Amino acid sequence: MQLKKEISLLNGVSLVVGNMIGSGIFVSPKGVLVHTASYGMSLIVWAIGGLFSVVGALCYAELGTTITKSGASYAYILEAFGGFIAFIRLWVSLLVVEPTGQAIIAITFANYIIQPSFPSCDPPYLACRLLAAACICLLTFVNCAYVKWGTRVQDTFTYAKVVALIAIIVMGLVKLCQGHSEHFQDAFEGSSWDMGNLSLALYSALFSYSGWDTLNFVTEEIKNPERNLPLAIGISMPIVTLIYILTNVAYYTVLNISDVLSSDAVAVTFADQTFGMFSWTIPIAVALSCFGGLNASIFASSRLFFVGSREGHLPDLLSMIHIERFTPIPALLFNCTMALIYLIVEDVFQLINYFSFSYWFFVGLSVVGQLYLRWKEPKRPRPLKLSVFFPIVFCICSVFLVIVPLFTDTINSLIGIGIALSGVPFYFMGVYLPESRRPLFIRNVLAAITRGTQQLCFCVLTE
Template sequence: MSTSYGEDSPLLGGADTASIRSSSIYKPPTDDEEGPSSPPEFGNIEDDVLPEESVLGRNIDWKSAYIIAISRVIGSGIFAVPGVILSSVGSVGLSLLVWILGAVVVACGLTVSLEYGCMLPRSGGDKVYLEFTYPWPRFFASTMIAVQAVLLGFTASNCVIFSQYVHFVFDVEARDFSKKALAVGLLTVITIIHGVWYRAGIRIQNFLGWIKVGLVVFMVLSALYVVILRPEQEDVDIRPRKIQSWDGLWDGSDWNLGTLATSLFKVFYSYAGLSNLNNVMNEVKDPVRTLKSVSLTALVTACLLYLLANLAYFAVVPIEDIKESGQLVAALFFERTFGPNIGKRFLPLAVALSAAGNVMVVTFSTARLNQEVARAGFLPFSRYLSSSKPFNAPLGGLIVHWIPSVLVIILPPSSEVYSFILEVEGYPGQIFALATSIGLIWLRYKRPDLKRPFKAWIPAVIFRIILCFSLLAAPFFPPSHPKPGGLFYATYAIVGVGILVFGVIYWLVWTIILPRLGGYRLEEKQEVLDDGTAITVLTRVPNDVD
């Protein structure tokens, strides 16, 4: 069961997740027993509960699940972020240190997601986990997740990278309008594919996902080719860079806390897809076992490829060129390695396709999360947005995802749009990471009876909590070398906090102030849509009615 408001209700509402705590434990019947053949209601998330199955069925096997994770991870991050990070922190040594520290933090966060995901194997990710952990104040966790999912659940960054690399490949002048138009066009085409041709969309994103993995491996082997064989070409200098001394690796380092925080947010973005599978668990075959093996495999794959890719950049491309490359560091790498024809045309085009594949995977999973938000009553016209009609796909969730993504692509200045997107996504994410980490420790104490197929290492969770507090404070420390004419250094943090404050005010107005002024209370009414989707409509009941 999920929750939905009536069509005449304003935005927001949510399931009364207090029922989660008091519900009876559902145990699947044995061969000698009679019992319900379908999973229990959505609220009954307890020990030994059967995973909820999507009306779309379980179509995601291990290979598709791995692609959903690794293809979300390997997107624009490794092809665009290294140049931006090196430009920010100033030195090769500190850049590599940021990537290593980021990987450690991501691994700690992954253990939290794995414990929650194996304990509560339902689609929705943090939405399910926070509703279960924090049922009171009523509707609060649900409201904050809904605000984050709808207003910050965009996939604009990879659309921007796709546009930039396509312009680079075809030597088209990268005007502001053309870059944004191409980015919006990509997002629109992908939304239509996932919304109309569900299975074809999965096949296409699987194909593009393997291209990504192959491209990073090819890039690493190319760097070894340059370093070991030292080829010479007349039209380009592809001699490997000299390995610096230990002291030289740290020349120009900027140890400012704010600078390190924004750099870490970019690393977190590059690893963001490791928990992507948690959002679509209702469609995964053998969800618990698949989640554990896929997530850990994707983590090891991503860490190894990212470290090798950074070393490849530093071995081939001059450091100053990397700093000035912005998001085009991979294009410079291929051009210096293979010359202006193959290196500038074919391989950067493959990077563009990789970014497009990332957009497909993010759109696929985020649409499912938006559909869960709609089922839980946090969107207007939730009956329509919760349904899988008319194409047996979450078209409503896709539309909800498309709108903020387009706005984020169009509104910020083109010169700063990529970094701004990564930072404004990353900052509120630390608040939710803090909430899930603290909640996991609380559940260990409060609910030791829950079945946990995977248990996070508590020191790793505590380390994540401490770092979350540090990253939340860091943006308000002025940078050592502010960019003239750029955005205020803490703009992304202010925007992120502003969105969450909006969520708090919204929750107060809808669930506290209006019911008291109107003399009514919210009660739940169960419904099942024509396509089999179970929802609960929250209705307004006068206080004088028993």
């Protein structure tokens, strides 16, 4: 009843890549450009953001191979900076960070699957919500059946999205070699060399690489983590940096700045421009990218809730496993149910502002916890130990990334801290308080429904 260590290097490369490259490059690559007002300076800020995130990813390779526990920001914060702190992390990612991510990726998939039929106008609302709910249900089933099914889906759809991006890059660079070299003649001109603009360029190019640790959430299942984890992160960082910069070169080569800065889906405009026919290949490619991203998010979130309940911070129940299949069925059903609730809210696209301070606070806290463990107990067996250079530069960068969204837009980050902190009563009244002191009614009904769903789902907790 152990959890099969079936995770492979390839499958790991696929998780990291196919979760980084989503719709952050297909439908909104105009974060750097608007605050930079030039071309060459935008490519340069892309490269710099890529370098800083590479350093961060090597820092997490070090952590993940030091501790070797799933959770990927919760096990480390726990072992290093406590369980209450760990419980704050689990509570925020239970309540608002994961369900909104999955709901929005499903909604965007739905938006972009039917777009060729509604090219200029807005596709309906009922149909978008129904296709999103159908997608989430299908993926939670595919992942509650086996685990090799989850990995085959991941491989297929990462291959698809990457071959589509290769199409875009090669067609752009075959345009750039047809003798035109047209927009690239007087680059760098008109740039905004203010500090108050390079700061926003860096911030918007550091939100574009978020997701570089989706392979740490499954560390307990990789074949032998000491070789497959750091190699997977080191092999999945430069691929994404190169594809980002080359796709940006393709965009800036074909279109000009007057519409790339005012286009609502830059890939679709590119397809309308160059591909005479086949203006429908790129929308379907964006739909496939979204489907793969959603699958990887379901993977990581199910494993995080699994660990959380295995620690006692959640019900004793989510730590079950299927007898004949070895898949955390109750955790996946719980995650699906939360996402299918959050689909019901109109205009969820706002909620991505209420946690843009929390998330990077937690990443930075995990890094400084690595520093604290490097100081306090320096005699643990560390298979690979890095110079303190990389945690230094990335903790600096995390100070930067938490300080930007507090000065501006303070009320949103403040209500975010309100949500994140809304979980301490449960802790202080039910969790930190020991066993056998709680009212007996709640324990009785809990165990009764536990046995109910257990017999219903064929799941006995880990051996």
